[PDB]
Design a protein around this ligand. Structure first.
Ligand SMILES: [Mg+2]
Ligand SMILES: [Mg+2]
Ligand SMILES: [Mg+2]
Ligand SMILES: [Mg+2]
Ligand SMILES: [Mg+2]
Ligand SMILES: [Mg+2]
Ligand SMILES: [Mg+2]
Ligand SMILES: [Mg+2]
Ligand SMILES: [Mg+2]
Ligand SMILES: [Mg+2]
Ligand SMILES: [Mg+2]
Ligand SMILES: [Mg+2]
Ligand SMILES: [Mg+2]
Ligand SMILES: [Mg+2]
Ligand SMILES: [Mg+2]
Ligand SMILES: [Mg+2]
Ligand SMILES: [Mg+2]
Ligand SMILES: [Mg+2]
Ligand SMILES: [Mg+2]
Ligand SMILES: [Mg+2]
Ligand SMILES: [Mg+2]
Ligand SMILES: [Mg+2]
Ligand SMILES: [Mg+2]
Ligand SMILES: [Zn+2]
Lengths: 48, 222, 153, 110, 115, 307
RNA sequence: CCAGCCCUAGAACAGGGCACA
RNA sequence: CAUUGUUAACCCAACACAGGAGUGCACCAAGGAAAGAUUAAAAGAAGUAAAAGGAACUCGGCAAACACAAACCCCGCCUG
């Protein structure tokens, strides 16, 4: 009775810059959902 | 409201056979049904078939059992009946339009959760034992063939086939008690999700069913 | 033996073929006219016909909704598919696409290439091979034969 | 396996000059009545297809420049018009592409 | 289809069919010219480490139409002279065996169930 | 002058193509309607049946397979052969064909004029019939000759008879030896390297060659095969269908040459059958819709039970 | 007669279809 | 306020080689593409599935397998 459409976000496993930005947003949301500041800093600084 | 029920045998195959053969076979099977009353039944319903056997005491031989599977196209439709007799399970593949059939009586019109419940060979004997002298159950048309949601147990591995593979797509088996999470994850490696969205391997026979229904109505009015 | 088969092998297997056809169909829905290999386009013709048949089936049909969700990779095409292509194809039954073999590709592969196009698009018309005019010699003789047949009845 | 003797030039010619290996002459060649170039009887004209491809590339470039986003697709019908043209009542309500170039001869109004 | 090295189950009440053994009763040789035996073909068995004859009652392979297909290769013991050494048969028996009564007379005379 | 290739659709117009299709279609229809009554125009003198005589055959279309139950409870498998269009094209005399038996030329179903050559189209124009797909020759005796241009009906055979069937089997292409001749292969994994399906040795040592009759991989399937002694059960007159027992060589929707069984056990069975052919105009009586054999369990049956 | 499009015909080459719909 | 090393897709294998490569970082926020285009003959390699039988093949249950167990001998204490 109502049009149910999927979101217009870019794909996740693609090579495009929009897909890269979506993966960046995904790991940023992971950092947001992290509970303790210790784990937040760990995930933010695990890259060297 | 009344829903039209077209028997599975009237559906012609996907091949490129000339439709005149299918028309002739449909005429012959309708003429056969004019004498032999083939009632309505689905996969899982319990039937009793009377066959003409020359080497028995009486010329008639009764056999009651649950319908395993129905397959075929036209005058060659077959259905398999399963019944446990004194601990020894027995499966007989009857033909719908065989002249040696005397009478078919559906004692319980009932569907199940799977279109092809061949797994009764691996199921427990409690689900294959059926009283031969059971009384026929009459139901109202407004029941709309109630689908029996019965989760079936399973004998330990190995089984007759690999019922855990996605190619079967079976829900009537209680897997959470017989299989483990590792086996469930491993069985998903043979899954082909694209075959459901392929949009081309489907068989659309709407107008075919319409024409067959019109022909059957004409034969009845004849 | 390859008797009685309708699908041709493409890509790295069945799933790779499905993904290639999915990408080609997405490009076709997005651009309304694309060009690819002749076999790929001939295979994509039927899938495009079926996709148009599903799009014409309505918006609330969740079967067609999830079908378009699987096929159209770019989700900005599903509203387009349901509100541009499907509405403009209502009286037409199966004449939705047009496929034409173009000259071979200038690259060294020299592959057989075709172009597929949805009818009624906002693009310049392809140089379709048209029939000869009725003023030709044979066409005029056939018109005379037709006039004689009509006068005989 | 190894060859036992050197094949003579006579047999070499008899092998690699047989009509099975010679390139056959294609007799389906015709001229395009529109531009006068060459084409086959079952294949579109290369020159006309190149013209159509250039025009389509220009039209798509302009319609993509109109949409500053990659996933911003038109939700309604689209119509392309050239210099010296105005959208009629049947062309109103749709997305409009405007080209500075005049409308070519092959492109029909419709 | 019962062939060589098939583990069959003796049905008729006999000592060889009732007494347990550290090796299941396997097949020996199908007396038909084809190495595959069907319902109603004389067979040889090695039961409890000795030779004996038997008759195939039912197999697990799908056969002709309207023919019962059991879930276990049931066989009944038979002597060399053509007489079953057992007393009675409990499991069902395909009614197609009663076609050739001349060779299965005493074997079917002890049969209680006919399917 | 490098003349190009030209087909019948290249120079026509959108308004002429359907006109041409209709002009050939109604022409073929009128021709088949004019050739529908051959016994009244000019039939050849019908000769009486002889013990050492033979009869002409038919060219039908293999539709498919069906089951057929007999009154004794048994079940046989029949194949449906549809006699769409059987016409006697030409007649070659005995002395001009074989010196022992005359030859009759029979044509199959109707095909298009737009794909046949000039000579075949000229022959069919002089005959007055549309072109046929498969053209076969039947060796008959000098007393069972029929005038060319006469149509034939599936009622040519009666319920209960033995026939022979000739056709091209399903051509499986260039297949291996295991599928062609049935040679056994080597074991799978006991060490065999690149030999799982090889034919092995093909000859001996001292012969220093291979014999001409050596079985080897090659073409498989596309060859004219003939099955003998197939019994016919049911004859449908309305749709011109013949029910032939057993397997019929040839894929479905293909042409199949049916003839009388030349087996020695059924050499003198053509006595009760119509000797020249089935003439529906001679008896002035319409046969039943389905001619069943004396043992076929008809669709309308009382569900026979043993006694 | 074989441009092109199919085939239960086929490695290529060959063979059968493209009018009833 | 001295001098020197700060590039790179790299080194060793005759090669832009499915090979040999020390240490610190997480398994992707970084790298790439198994397919030049067709048809889908035989044989060959790999994978998946297969009714009834479950080693009857074979020197050997070699490989494979919904199992991945228990025992008896010969030689060597065992790890190496
Ligand atoms: Mg012993
Ligand atoms: Mg073939
Ligand atoms: Mg083998
Ligand atoms: Mg080795
Ligand atoms: Mg080796
Ligand atoms: Mg190997
Ligand atoms: Mg010699
Ligand atoms: Mg040809
Ligand atoms: Mg550096
Ligand atoms: Mg590559
Ligand atoms: Mg490649
Ligand atoms: Mg490829
Ligand atoms: Mg192969
Ligand atoms: Mg293999
Ligand atoms: Mg396996
Ligand atoms: Mg197996
Ligand atoms: Mg199995
Ligand atoms: Mg051996
Ligand atoms: Mg052994
Ligand atoms: Mg191992
Ligand atoms: Mg082991
Ligand atoms: Mg083990
Ligand atoms: Mg040691
Ligand atoms: Zn041009």
């Amino acid at each position: 009775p109502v049009a149910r459409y999927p979101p217009i976000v870019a794909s996740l496993t693609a090579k495009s810059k929009a897909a890269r930005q979506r993966r960046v947003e995904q790991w940023q949301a992971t950092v947001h959902a992290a509970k303790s500041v210790d784990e937040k800093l760990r995930i933010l600084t695990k890259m060297q | 409201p009344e829903t039209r029920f077209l028997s599975p045998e009237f559906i012609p195959p996907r091949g490129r056979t000339n439709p005149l053969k299918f028309q002739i076979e449909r005429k012959d099977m309708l003429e056969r049904r004019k004498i032999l009353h083939i009632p309505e039944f689905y996969v899982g319903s319990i039937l009793r078939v009377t066959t003409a056997d020359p080497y028995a005491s009486a010329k008639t031989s009764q056999f009651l059992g649950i319908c395993i599977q129905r397959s075929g196209s036209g005058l060659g439709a077959t259905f398999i009946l399963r019944n446990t007799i004194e601990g020894q399970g027995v499966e007989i593949c009857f033909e719908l339009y065989n002249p040696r059939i005397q009478e078919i009586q559906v004692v319980k019109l009932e569907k199940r959760l799977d279109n092809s419940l061949l797994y009764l060979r691996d199921a427990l004997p409690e689900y294959s034992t059926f009283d031969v002298n059971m009384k026929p159950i009459t139901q109202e048309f407004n029941q709309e063939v109630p689908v029996n949601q019965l989760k079936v147990k399973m004998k330990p591995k190995p089984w007759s086939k690999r019922w855990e593979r996605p190619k079967f797509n079976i829900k009537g088996i209680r897997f959470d008690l017989c299989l483990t999470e590792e086996q469930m994850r491993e069985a998903q490696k043979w899954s082909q999700p694209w075959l459901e969205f392929d949009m081309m391997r489907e068989y659309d026979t709407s107008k075919i069913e319409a024409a067959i229904w019109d022909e059957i109505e004409a034969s009845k009015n004849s | 033996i390859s008797h009685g088969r309708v699908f041709r092998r493409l890509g790295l297997g069945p799933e790779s073929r499905i993904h290639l056809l999915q990408n080609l169909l997405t490009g076709l829905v997005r651009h309304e006219r694309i060009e690819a290999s002749w076999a790929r386009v001939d295979e994509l013709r039927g899938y495009a016909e079926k996709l148009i048949d599903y799009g014409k089936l309505g918006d609330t049909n969740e079967r067609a909704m999830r079908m378009a969700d699987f096929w159209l990779t770019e989700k900005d095409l599903i509203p387009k598919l349901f509100q541009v292509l499907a509405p403009r194809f209502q009286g037409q039954n199966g004449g939705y696409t047009r496929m034409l073999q173009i000259p071979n590709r200038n690259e060294q592969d020299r592959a057989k290439m075709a172009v597929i196009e949805y009818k009624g698009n906002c693009l310049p018309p392809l140089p379709l091979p048209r029939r000869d005019s009725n003023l030709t010699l044979l066409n005029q003789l056939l018109q005379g034969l037709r006039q004689d047949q009509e006068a005989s009845s | 396996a190894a060859p036992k003797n050197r094949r003579s030039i006579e047999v070499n010619r008899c092998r690699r000059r047989n009509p099975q290996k010679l390139i056959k002459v294609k007799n389906n060649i015709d001229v395009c009545p529109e531009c006068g170039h060459l084409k086959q009887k079952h294949i579109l004209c290369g020159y006309c297809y190149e013209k159509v491809r250039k025009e389509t590339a220009e039209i798509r470039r302009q319609m993509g420049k109109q949409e500053g986003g990659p996933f911003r697709a038109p939700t309604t019908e689209t119509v392309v018009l050239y210099s010296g043209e105005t959208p009629s009542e049947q062309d109103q309500g749709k997305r409009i592409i405007e080209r500075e170039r005049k409308r070519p001869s092959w492109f029909t109004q419709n | 289809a019962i062939q060589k090295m098939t583990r069959v189950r003796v049905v008729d009440n006999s000592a060889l069919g009732t007494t347990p053994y550290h090796r299941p009763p396997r097949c020996i040789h199908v007396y038909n010219k084809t190495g595959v035996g069907k319902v109603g073909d004389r067979i040889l068995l090695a039961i409890r480490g000795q030779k004996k004859k038997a008759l195939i009652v039912g197999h697990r392979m799908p056969g002709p139409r309207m023919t019962p297909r059991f879930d276990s290769n049931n066989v009944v013991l038979l002597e060399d002279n053509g007489n079953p050494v057992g007393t009675r048969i409990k499991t069902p028996i395909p009614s197609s065996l009663r076609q050739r009564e001349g060779e299965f007379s005493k074997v079917l005379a002890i049969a209680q169930n006919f399917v | 002058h490098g003349k190009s290739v030209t087909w019948w659709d290249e120079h026509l117009s959108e308004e002429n193509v359907p006109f041409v299709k209709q002009l050939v279609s109604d022409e073929n229809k009128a021709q088949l309607a004019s050739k529908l009554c051959p016994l009244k125009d000019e039939p050849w003198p019908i000769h009486p049946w002889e013990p050492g005589s033979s009869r002409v055959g038919l060219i039908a279309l293999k539709l498919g397979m069906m089951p057929l139950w007999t009154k004794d409870g048994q079940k046989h498998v029949v194949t449906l052969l549809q006699v769409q269009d059987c016409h006697v094209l030409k007649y070659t005399p005995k002395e001009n064909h074989n010196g022992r038996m005359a030859a009759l030329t029979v044509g199959g179903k109707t095909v298009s004029h737009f794909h046949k050559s000039a000579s075949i189209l000229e022959f069919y124009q002089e005959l007055g019939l549309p072109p046929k797909q498969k053209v076969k020759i039947f060796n008959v005796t000098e007393n069972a000759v029929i005038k060319p241009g006469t149509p034939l009906y599936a009622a040519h055979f009666r319920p209960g008879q033995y026939v022979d069937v000739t056709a091209k089997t399903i051509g499986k292409g260039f297949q291996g030896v295991m599928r062609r001749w049935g040679f056994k292969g080597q074991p799978a994994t006991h060490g065999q390297t690149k030999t799982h399906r090889r034919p092995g040795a093909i000859s001996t040592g001292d012969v220093a060659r291979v014999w001409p009759g050596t079985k080897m991989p090659g073409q498989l399937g596309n060859i004219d095969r003939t099955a003998f002694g197939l019994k016919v059960w049911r004859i449908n007159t309305k749709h011109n269908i013949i029910y032939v027992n057993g397997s019929v060589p040839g894929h479905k929707n293909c042409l199949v040459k049916i003839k009388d069984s030349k087996l020695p056990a059924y050499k003198d069975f053509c006595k009760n059958l119509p000797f020249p052919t089935y003439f529906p105009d001679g008896d002035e009586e319409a046969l039943p819709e389905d001619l069943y054999d004396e043992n076929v369990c008809q669709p309308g049956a009382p569900s026979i039970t043993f006694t």
